[PDB]
Amino acid sequence: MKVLIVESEFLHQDTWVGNAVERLADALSQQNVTVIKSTSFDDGFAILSSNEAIDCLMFSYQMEHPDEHQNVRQLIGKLHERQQNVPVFLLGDREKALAAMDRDLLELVDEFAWILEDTADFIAGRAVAAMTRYRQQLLPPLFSALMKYSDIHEYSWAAPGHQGGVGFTKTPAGRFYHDYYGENLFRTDMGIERTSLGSLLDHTGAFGESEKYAARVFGADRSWSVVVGTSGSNRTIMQACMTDNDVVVVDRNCHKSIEQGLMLTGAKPVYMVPSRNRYGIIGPIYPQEMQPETLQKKISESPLTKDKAGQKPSYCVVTNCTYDGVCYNAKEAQDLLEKTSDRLHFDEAWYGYARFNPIYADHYAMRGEPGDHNGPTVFATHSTHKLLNALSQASYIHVREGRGAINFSRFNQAYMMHATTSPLYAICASNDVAVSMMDGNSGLSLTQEVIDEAVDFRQAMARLYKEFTADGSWFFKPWNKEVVTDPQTGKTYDFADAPTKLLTTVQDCWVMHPGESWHGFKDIPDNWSMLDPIKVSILAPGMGEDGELEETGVPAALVTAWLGRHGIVPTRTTDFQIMFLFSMGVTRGKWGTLVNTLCSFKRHYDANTPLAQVMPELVEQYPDTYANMGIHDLGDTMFAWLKENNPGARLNEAYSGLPVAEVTPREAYNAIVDNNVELVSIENLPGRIAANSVIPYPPGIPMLLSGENFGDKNSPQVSYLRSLQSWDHHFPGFEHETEGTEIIDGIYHVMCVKA
Amino acid sequence: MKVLIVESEFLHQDTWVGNAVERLADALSQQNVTVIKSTSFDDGFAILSSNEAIDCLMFSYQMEHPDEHQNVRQLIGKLHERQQNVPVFLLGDREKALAAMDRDLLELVDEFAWILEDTADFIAGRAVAAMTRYRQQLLPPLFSALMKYSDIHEYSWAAPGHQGGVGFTKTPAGRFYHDYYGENLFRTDMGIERTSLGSLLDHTGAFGESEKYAARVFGADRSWSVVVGTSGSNRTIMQACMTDNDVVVVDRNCHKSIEQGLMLTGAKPVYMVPSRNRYGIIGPIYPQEMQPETLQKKISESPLTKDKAGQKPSYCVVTNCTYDGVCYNAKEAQDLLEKTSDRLHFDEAWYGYARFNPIYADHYAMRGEPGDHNGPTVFATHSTHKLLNALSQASYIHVREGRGAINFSRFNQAYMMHATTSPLYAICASNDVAVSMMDGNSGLSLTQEVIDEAVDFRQAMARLYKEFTADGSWFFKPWNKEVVTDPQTGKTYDFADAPTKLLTTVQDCWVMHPGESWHGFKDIPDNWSMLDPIKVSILAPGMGEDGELEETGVPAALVTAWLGRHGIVPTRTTDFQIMFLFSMGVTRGKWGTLVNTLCSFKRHYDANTPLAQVMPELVEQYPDTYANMGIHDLGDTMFAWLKENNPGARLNEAYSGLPVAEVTPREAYNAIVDNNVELVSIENLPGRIAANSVIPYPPGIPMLLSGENFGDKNSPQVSYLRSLQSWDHHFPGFEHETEGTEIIDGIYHVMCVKA
Amino acid sequence: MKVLIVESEFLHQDTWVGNAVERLADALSQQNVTVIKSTSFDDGFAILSSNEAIDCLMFSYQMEHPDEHQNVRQLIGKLHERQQNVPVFLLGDREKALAAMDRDLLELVDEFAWILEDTADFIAGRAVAAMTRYRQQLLPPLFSALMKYSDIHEYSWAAPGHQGGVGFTKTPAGRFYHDYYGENLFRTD
Amino acid sequence: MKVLIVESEFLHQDTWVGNAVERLADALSQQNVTVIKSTSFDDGFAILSSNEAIDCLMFSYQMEHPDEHQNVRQLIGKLHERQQNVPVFLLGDREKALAAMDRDLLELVDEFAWILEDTADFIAGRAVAAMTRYRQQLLPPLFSALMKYSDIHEYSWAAPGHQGGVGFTKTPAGRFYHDYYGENLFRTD
Ligand SMILES: *Cc1c(COP(=O)(O)O)cnc(C)c1O
Numbered sequence A, B: 001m002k003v004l005i006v007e008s009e010f011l012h013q014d015t016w017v018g019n020a021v022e023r024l025a026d027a028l029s030q031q032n033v034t035v036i037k038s039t040s041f042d043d044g045f046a047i048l049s050s051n052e053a054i055d056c057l058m059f060s061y062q063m064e065h066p067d068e069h070q071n072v073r074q075l076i077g078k079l080h081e082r083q084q085n086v087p088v089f090l091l092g093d094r095e096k097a098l099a100a101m102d103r104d105l106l107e108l109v110d111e112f113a114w115i116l117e118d119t120a121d122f123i124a125g126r127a128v129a130a131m132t133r134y135r136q137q138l139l140p141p142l143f144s145a146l147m148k149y150s151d152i153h154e155y156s157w158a159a160p161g162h163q164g165g166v167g168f169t170k171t172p173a174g175r176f177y178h179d180y181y182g183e184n185l186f187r188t189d190m191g192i193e194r195t196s197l198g199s200l201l202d203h204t205g206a207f208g209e210s211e212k213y214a215a216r217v218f219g220a221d222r223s224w225s226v227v228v229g230t231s232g233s234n235r236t237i238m239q240a241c242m243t244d245n246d247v248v249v250v251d252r253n254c255h256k257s258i259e260q261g262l263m264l265t266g267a268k269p270v271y272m273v274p275s276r277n278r279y280g281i282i283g284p285i286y287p288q289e290m291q292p293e294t295l296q297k298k299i300s301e302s303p304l305t306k307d308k309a310g311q312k313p314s315y316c317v318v319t320n321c322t323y324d325g326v327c328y329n330a331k332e333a334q335d336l337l338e339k340t341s342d343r344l345h346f347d348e349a350w351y352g353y354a355r356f357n358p359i360y361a362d363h364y365a366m367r368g369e370p371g372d373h374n375g376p377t378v379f380a381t382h383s384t385h386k387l388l389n390a391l392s393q394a395s396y397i398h399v400r401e402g403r404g405a406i407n408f409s410r411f412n413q414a415y416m417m418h419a420t421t422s423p424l425y426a427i428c429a430s431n432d433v434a435v436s437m438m439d440g441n442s443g444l445s446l447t448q449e450v451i452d453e454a455v456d457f458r459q460a461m462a463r464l465y466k467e468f469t470a471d472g473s474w475f476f477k478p479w480n481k482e483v484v485t486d487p488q489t490g491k492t493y494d495f496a497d498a499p500t501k502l503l504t505t506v507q508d509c510w511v512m513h514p515g516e517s518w519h520g521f522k523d524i525p526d527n528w529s530m531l532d533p534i535k536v537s538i539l540a541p542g543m544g545e546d547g548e549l550e551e552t553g554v555p556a557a558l559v560t561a562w563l564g565r566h567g568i569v570p571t572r573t574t575d576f577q578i579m580f581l582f583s584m585g586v587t588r589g590k591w592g593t594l595v596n597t598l599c600s601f602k603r604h605y606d607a608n609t610p611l612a613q614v615m616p617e618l619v620e621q622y623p624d625t626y627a628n629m630g631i632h633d634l635g636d637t638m639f640a641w642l643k644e645n646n647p648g649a650r651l652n653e654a655y656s657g658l659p660v661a662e663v664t665p666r667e668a669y670n671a672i673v674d675n676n677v678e679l680v681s682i683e684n685l686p687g688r689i690a691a692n693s694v695i696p697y698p699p700g701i702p703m704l705l706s707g708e709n710f711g712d713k714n715s716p717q718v719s720y721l722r723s724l725q726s727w728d729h730h731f732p733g734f735e736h737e738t739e740g741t742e743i744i745d746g747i748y749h750v751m752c753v754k755a
Numbered sequence C, D: 001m002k003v004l005i006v007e008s009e010f011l012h013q014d015t016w017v018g019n020a021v022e023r024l025a026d027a028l029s030q031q032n033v034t035v036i037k038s039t040s041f042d043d044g045f046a047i048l049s050s051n052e053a054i055d056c057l058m059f060s061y062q063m064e065h066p067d068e069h070q071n072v073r074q075l076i077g078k079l080h081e082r083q084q085n086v087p088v089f090l091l092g093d094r095e096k097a098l099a100a101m102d103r104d105l106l107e108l109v110d111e112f113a114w115i116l117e118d119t120a121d122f123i124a125g126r127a128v129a130a131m132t133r134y135r136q137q138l139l140p141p142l143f144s145a146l147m148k149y150s151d152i153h154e155y156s157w158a159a160p161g162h163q164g165g166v167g168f169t170k171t172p173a174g175r176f177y178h179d180y181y182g183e184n185l186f187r188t189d
């Protein structure tokens, strides 16, 4: 038990107050309470801004000057952001406190202690009971149950065989490994223990309680806890939603696990094509692609769906937000899509936090409270380890029940289908805690901080870009709205000059309006998508606002390599874009290290520092290519290549018309099983059918899926692979990653169904 | 760093040796080495029989008396059981040690230190160097890489969002959680870090190195580390092996994950029927059920496979060992089954340790050294968390490549289909450590200890049974051979009287020989199956050797409940059988607690203690049923029920002939997706196609799989459910579990396909 | 939690036995268990004839001499006169103990620890478990229930007015009175 | 690892700044970092004029008075004369530091810590990480490699015969000589 005691600076002159507080702190030590003593409200505010966990706040209070009243409000306000239920003791004057007694006081203060008129032991006893009560309600229901149960549980005569870790201790390596992870991970790793705890696969007991909690917090009718990631989540939903008799509508921006659902169900796919901009960033699917008549036509025209014309699609999937933080107006999206399908699945894997900050209002599935069952059935999936706080593999299926709803009995057969009979309860616990953190005041507080940090980073870089540009020198710039408007005044600000409170709280600062050139999504309708403040792309010069390469530029590839030599690995990297991921796990000011490294890159680029000094692992690993070359020399050679080969346009061509779907993904998968596939060299790809998906980076969405034909000898899909290969060949050490290829002696191969 | 120094008691009279060793110990302390000082070989033996991890052993050695020579061999032999590579320093006499110089001496001793002729610092220095060498080779490849890499890794700008656990610390619940688990779990929870570690899904870098190590240790051509249990391992293998064009042969004793594979692939199944015994325990599939013409016939006559007569099945699976510890002679099983199928899948989920003890020789898939590809392709699956040492969800697919082998490019598409793109590296790390523990001497030592403990518990029980029997009183008895043979003599023993070294090392003692009535598997051929010593079933009295209930009996359900009140949970409980799982995690002598609790049961049973005293929770909850009864009263009532209802006969009838397969399990699963299913009450079950599998406990194997008909009015399956249901109604608190049922107001229901 | 460990004098010549028991006593102390060490059966007898309440008896046992077999019977018999359900640990030799295995041995011994073949921590953990189970069953049902309920009970807005003794503390006489009788009297009232 | 922390005399009135810096000091100690605490720029200037090697400099900064701006330029300029790549942490005010953000600020400051809004452990971890990176680039190529290699090196079976100095210790005169010059001279031979 930790108590924070703030002595008000407005009473230091009344020394007897200090004496009385010391007597109380003494009484608290005697009962084994850890006592933190603060001598000003400001010291207290700062302690409460740290991650210091306390069980009780006590404070003294003169109650005369207006500045103190405010200090009190601020203090208890700060406490209650992330420590919402902590009990507050006023160590006050009876007369003054009772004169001031009203709803506002009681909102602030939970317990009253007349410091100059009571016994220290009495107050301390009351403080211990309050702290006990607080601690008893602190932990979420699954984590709490697992913990309690493991204190009584007999680890013998059942699996797991290690028996709360004892197995590992039996060899030195096992023992070292055991002590490195500590016992509690092993103690809470118990097998199915029902009447005690319940079952994950049955959704009973404390596992059930945890799922109900999750639903209340995330605004779903029902939530399913998953230990196989959003991979297992997506496989589950799709198993439950479609058979090989069904037509389905699939976002071309879909995860591998969406394709896996196709392969596992045998369903008949039609694809919604997303936009893109000059940076190779994938934008939203436009409203036009979601119109019921657009969908009807795709179905009628497609070789996979023709013979099922006019059949109602059983499932529809959209990825929201995208990898680069394009967030759809899901409320608008639902309206169009539900005119086609009764089952809507928004794959929100990177986006579980959205509900808990007003800035995302309307741009996610679980808006407001659930309960209105008139409308379609909606699934949202979260990888809670992505941008909530949880262990890898932790995941949720969130469900709003509507038309075409699927009851527990039916859906749980799909759940079990993709589950394990022996789940690791450490994962489930982290999933339970993930929810706790978003519950009440803290959900807002945690999300606001990520937004705040990302914005400070964004403004800093806008400011620096502006500064450098006035000296006729180049710099990186953030990818976000350039000119912003305060909606109360009518006042306009460039991004750098904007009040940060406007940027961090007003949605309109992020909305992609038509006519704004920054987003680069040509003819996007208004009020359709926004940019997530926390997905911060940074743009190296080289791409012009018209969508053509400039006379000079700085290739991100070289910047990403420089960054890496400092541990820093951006999540994504195009030709000029570099995306940095801000989360609830980031600490304040940490972005300052990004700036420092981008500045040091700039200083070396301009000095043209020999690669032997700045990138020695590159130079000694490829002596011939990079000897006698500086960093600017390499930027230059890399930019020449971009100019000569126009990969951006190659890209766009490869993504404009979908390749012809010859067979379904399942059918194409089955070719593998039938040993009826072979590795085809790049130059032989035209006319061959992909045995697996092909996902180039960039744009990091599928170019082909399994079962699609590469096309004729004029194939843009094959030619885009040609350019990636060429870049790889010309700049060793800077190779692209393409999912679904095999490189043989530097030559690209894809697995294809036999002739 | 830890040194054990054993001062030979044959030199205590030479007090200068003591002085010289103490000068060494001091010098070691100055180099920050922890020194454990032992003053006899016996003390040293004891220390080395604990889980104490030492980095160096040093000992003095008079080298005159045969007893000391023996003590030395015993000491070093003991060290090297579980601490095989620990350096051994002889603190010796130069002249005597060098006169003794031969290969036997150099096998015992790594380093020679002339303790009365050297400087203590020089010896300390060489000891520190040796200990460093030992510690640098100690850890398996992946755990080591993860550990090293987390020390330098940048947790920012990368998912997972918590960044080495930092995110959790920001709310008080989340901090409690973080600190309960400790930071290292979170610090090794990194996302794909490609050039540093490699990838699980790509099988590269440290991950691939770990799999090659696992394959070497486990005798495979190749291993696949899995983070989704054997559930996921199984789905992978089947996904790789079959389409809806294939016939497949399936052990009717199959895990839910096998059915899942059938439902995911759409393949056409035919079943091999396992034997069974008077106790309700499932036995092995007899060789006749695996004969080429037997299977060819099964196919010919099956509704699901009729029109695919004379197709080679593309896969065949057998569960080995069974839940209760029945192990197949996999050598002979393979010989038969390879005549039908080129792919053999042995599901060894409960059986990962078998290769590392001679007692199991020939009764597991990965026998001797891999290399010969003139044979079938064989898969073995291990749930490494089950009876190896590993966190839940950790699993391996071990493969021997033969005819019909699936290469890497093909198999890995099946791998990913069932994977997650975000694996918890904690799980992987424990899978790497499970391998380490089984590598070399320690594999033998660990598995031998489990066998030794289980045999001690068995022998104690056999003795007690014999003693109580001789006294005209009843007792529990172990389910194992009655009479045993020393094959080196021909001498004969009661299990109870047999030398334990015979029972713990000689396989013939566990073999189920034709005619032997202990096992109960009528007309089983010789050299076909054995019992695993470590799966200990205890048998309560009541079932006669002729397979008919006796005149009295103690129902096991009563015993299981009494064990609950002491926090002992058997993994399996039938009518008269109680199974206790022994593993590498159990500590020595722990079985004694089982004997104490079973004894106290007997004591209360014979005294007919009021249920109010000994089962108060039960009396509290159903006061009307268990009012004014003793424990013996209730056992009598339960036994009367068994006599009247004869559940064993119903079990046997329900398992004699397979239910008719109307549709494949996939086709049936699809009926759920179409909303074409309903909850059907017990009496309306005849005529109905089951939409999910039904697994009653006992015998704990599917009575029906998805798509099978319950049968006509006479249906034995339905009558079996009836008596399960009847038991429950008669004995509230002792309810059976049945997977795939729903119980509504006490009436069993099963989801079936609509008529 | 309190353990009495009795080292058989029939084994003082085997110094490694005392070494292994020392590591066990150390491991128990690390778990906040009070350890009483006794170096002979007679000493153990005398301790057990005092009003000394213990939660576990551990003893070593050569199992060779009839005089020792008798000492063991006498020691555990004494334990169980007034401390009937105190769990008993044989810190034993595996082979000799398992050879002697029968109903008489089991009335003497609840738990087996192969003192020369096991990790001290493992044995210590099993003793703590057994001692916890012992203490949970120790107290008769009303006293036990009063004790438990007082630890979670709200002494306010309820008679008696003294409220777990607080009322008495308000004058020096009442306060002297309160401290003299102690809080538990007032708290169970 | 040695950190110098300069507490600007311009903030001594804001006593809460001092409290927060103390929490950071203690967090740094707990990570076994040596903390030199300086309570004025002038004291800071002097320490940096001595031959004191530090792996990180942290300072507070009110950012109002022209005298302080100069103090900061002078302290950091001094640091970087002879300790050029020492990481500098500003223990600063977010609003003010970020209103002042520009190339000039970035030449002075490598790392930003909002001292009144952050956890002491998060800042200490970031400091340790920066000091680790500094030490790894600190030494020149050959002395670095010699130093590293001598640690893993087998002195035996080749020349010099002294084998990292052990030879010298075998007579009293040689051992005197050996301990006089210390072992590293011989180990790098
Ligand atoms: C990562 C991701 C998934 C898969 O989640 P895992 O938790 O990695 O299995 C599914 N959909 C999207 C959009 C993702 O980004």
Ligand SMILES: *Cc1c(COP(=O)(O)O)cnc(C)c1O
Binding pocket: A420, A421, A422, B228, B229, B230, B231, B232, B234, B255, B257, B319, B347, B348, B349, B350, B383, B393, B395
């Ligand atoms: C438990 C088990 C499985 C499934 O393994 P999990 O690790 O629980 O996914 C598969 N087959 C058998 C025989 C099993 O016992």
